[PDB]
């Protein structure tokens with residue numbers, strides 16, 4: 101298929117960035133359609149490590165035009181810092197990055213509000229990345245927020261910003277008893293980069309429609325993961341955007357009937373960083389092992405991630421919400437050496453019932469217990485292996501079982517962080 | 532196709548409800564996926580008129596199960612009133628209506644906030660329907676809002692509601708200098724119907740996936756119109772939800788790859804009710820004529836709608852955002868008698884450029900002027916005509932021109948309000 105979507109089937113950090121960089125060899129465009137700079141996608145080419153946050157993962161390739169769709173909430177400060185660090189590494193960002201004028205802006209008061217609300221939550225804190233993501237989406241839905249297009253008229257932008265900030269400062273000071281945000285600082289900072297942002301503007305929707313008609317290869321890079329979806333995720337312990345495949349359309353302008361192949365990124369075990377339900381969470385030595393061997397630490401905040409076994413019940417939910425075409429199993433190599441590997445196949449509900457579907461809201465996960473299926477591990481190393489043949493039999497059975505429990509084929513298996521430490525059993529573009 | 536989506540290509544009130552009722556003869560399910568009770572969809576069967584707002588338009592048919600997906604923001608008070616009025620007319624609503632526990636709730640403070648914000652806007656007022664839609668979507672995105680699922684634990688629901696209302700009352704009283712909302716009134720009212728709402732709950736996402744696998748016919752009924760989209764519409768003069776086809780997935784749980792046919796409802800002329808850009812808006816006698824002959828008055832608020840000529844530039848945008856498969860032309864019959872009919876084919880920008888694409892944000896429409904193409908009308912009546920043969924040649928040319936300028940076929944033509952005053956040139960389910 102020409103239009104391929106890459107997204108996380110779990111709670112983020114499944115290894116989307118790597119797969120995007122690897123697959124954009126044959127793509128003309130790569131599009132981010134939701135989230136903002138809370139995302140941290142790691143790329144490792146020949147040992148060199150790049151960590152992107154806002155800029156699409158196809159930025160290192162000269163043949164690809166990277167696009168930030170309207171679904172993304174843009175921090176002008178975050179972008180400039182990312183653009184700079186990349187330009188210093190020989191990446192002509194400005195030559196390959198385009199963006200939507202419909203993208204809402206994340207300004208200082210948004211970050212302030214984020215911290216304030218989280219402090220007001222106390223123990224019930226969501227555990228946001230503190231980047232002002234949620235507040236920026238609120239201003240959008242409330243129809244009071246500023247977008248990239250507003251930068252086009254600096255006179256009226258100052259009028260609009262003045263009004264919005266008046267509203268937010270009142271609540272910051274009066275309700276949250278916090279420090280007000282300086283209007284002039286924000287006005288100066290933003291205006292000091294307005295021309296750079298507006299020069300990269302393009303009608304993303306029309307462009308994507310033309311690419312579709314020309315048969316160009318387009319890749320949509322997802323942020324966060326399915327269970328963090330604002331609608332279908334573990335509310336309220338979720339991100340404020342739709343992380344599921346439907347977000348591709350609302351966040352880029354591409355008609356849903358043009359999504360050809362949806363590739364779900366699936367890690368061999370599970371992780372979650374921030375508050376919220378997590379049935380297969382390990383607290384023992386095997387947990388510390390997965391964390392240590394997997395190097396599980398937030399690429400954006402540095403928080404150590406929670407680890408656990410693969411949950412096929414939750415994954416099956418990701419299969420249906422996204423109409424997954426195939427999977428890309430990652431971090432198989434971290435499972436090396438373990439005596440046995442488990443995989444949750446059902447949930448025991450607090451009332452005694454054994455279910456095979458997930459609850460929705462966070463409160464409904466409260467007493468859920470995972471029902472495992474134990475499988476033999478392998479001591480042999482699978483790291484860097486680029487052929488099924490190099491995989492121990494136990495690894496192959498583990499892979500086949502996942503396919504069995506899921507009903508979706510694993511088309512790509514990743515065995516290391518480097519771009520080349522992979523094995524594409526099937527290319528989504530060819531399929 | 533089995534999964535058919537019906538939505539408005541303009542600014543709402545194109546005649547979606549009628550088409551839904553008419554096409555659900557062969558459907559098992561009908562799903563609302565966004566909006567709330569701001570919608571007013573009229574159905575006329577054998578002269579009897581039904582106006583639904585929240586309940587899907589397939590409610591009059593015994594063979595269809597009506598579903599309110601998670602994308603809909605539900606007013607418990609609006610639902611009860613609608614359910615009652617229908618049950619009095621011999622419609623066993625409770626027997627055929629199911630709903631998502633993920634639907635956010637619209638309570639009294641939401642309506643209060645809506646009125647307050649609109650008064651604070653003054654001249655720049657959006658012109659909302661005052662049903663608390665926007666505020667309810669904000670609470671959702673802010674992750675502080677209550678959902679149907681919360682009604683399941685009345686003890687903790689009172690705790691949650693208390694917190695949220697504390698927040699909103701402070702701003703209502705202190706910032707907006709308005710009247711506070713009584714917590715007990717809300718708590719009593721809501722709790723007085725909790726058991727009715729929770730008894731209708733179903734895991735919509737899983738259900739839709741099963742229907743897909745069984746090959747059941749499913750129809751998605753859209754609310755509002757494309758240009759009112761929160762992302763792609765004339766921001767900030769828009770509704771707070773995604774009215775475009777991508778909203779089908781985020782608002783129901785259905786994977787985007789399963790959308791088979793997207794039918795766009797297209798009125799023969801244009802209307803808009805509320806503030807905002809409208810290039811083809813007529814202010815003369817022809818405008819008053821379209822309004823009068825079309826009976827253009829808000830089905831929800833009673834506001835008289837603004838009228839104008841059909842805008843193919845704006846419609847072409849709706850074609851791409853939704854990946855439209857075909858159109859359903861409605862109200863052709865209102866054009867009867869007119870000497871000539873125009874249809875905007877391009878825009879003259881304030882700087883002199885002639886463009887064929889629409890601007891995005893409302894501020895960018897400011898000086899846009901429509902460039903028409905005049906066509907001969909017809910004095911002969913087309914009302915109730917159920918065969919192309921009964922259509923005057925000028926009508927057929929008008930229809931063919933629209934197809935020419937759009938590149939999308941008109942598969943259904945409506946010639947009157949009654950269910951039977953139609954002509955299906957092609958059924959989306961068979962196509």
Ligand SMILES: O=C(O)[C@H](CCCN1C(=O)N[C@@]2(O[C@H](COP(=O)(O)O)[C@@H](O)[C@H]2O)C1=O)N(O)CO
Nearest residue numbers: 112138140227228229338339374398399400401402
């Ligand atoms: O916390 C970090 O450092 C991130 C986590 C990435 C996934 N992720 C988010 O981007 N946001 C998260 O979703 C929830 C809402 O946070 P926010 O509103 O900031 O997006 C929190 O759990 C927050 O941690 C969330 O889980 N890195 O792992 C990403 O490389």
Ligand SMILES: O=C(O)[C@H](CCCN1C(=O)N[C@@]2(O[C@H](COP(=O)(O)O)[C@@H](O)[C@H]2O)C1=O)N(O)CO
Nearest residue numbers: 543569571658659660769770805829830831832833
């Ligand atoms: O105003 C009415 O009586 C409605 C208008 C239906 C279309 N429509 C909406 O439902 N909302 C509208 O979108 C904008 C935002 O309003 P709201 O936030 O309440 O949805 C306003 O222009 C509002 O009028 C809008 O244009 N009826 O025509 C529907 O039968």
Ligand SMILES: Nc1nc2c(ncn2[C@@H]2O[C@H](COP(=O)(O)OP(=O)(O)O)[C@@H](O)[C@H]2O)c(=O)[nH]1
Nearest residue numbers: 113114115116117140141142431514515516517
């Ligand atoms: N061992 C191992 N590490 C991997 C593999 N694929 C990706 N990674 C690493 O796992 C981490 C994935 O988390 P992150 O960078 O946040 O990924 P993303 O945000 O989902 O794209 C990165 O540090 C990668 O270098 C793999 O197959 N094996």
Ligand SMILES: Nc1nc2c(ncn2[C@@H]2O[C@H](COP(=O)(O)OP(=O)(O)O)[C@@H](O)[C@H]2O)c(=O)[nH]1
Nearest residue numbers: 544545546547548571572573862945946947948
């Ligand atoms: N004359 C005429 N009226 C129609 C036709 N189709 C629908 N209508 C009427 O047009 C109005 C459509 O607006 P509304 O009821 O808000 O439709 P919806 O909300 O888009 O489904 C209704 O009052 C219908 O009875 C048609 O083909 N001809």
Ligand SMILES: [Mg+2]
Nearest residue numbers: 113140141399
């Ligand atoms: Mg990450």
Ligand SMILES: [Mg+2]
Nearest residue numbers: 544571572830
């Ligand atoms: Mg209506």
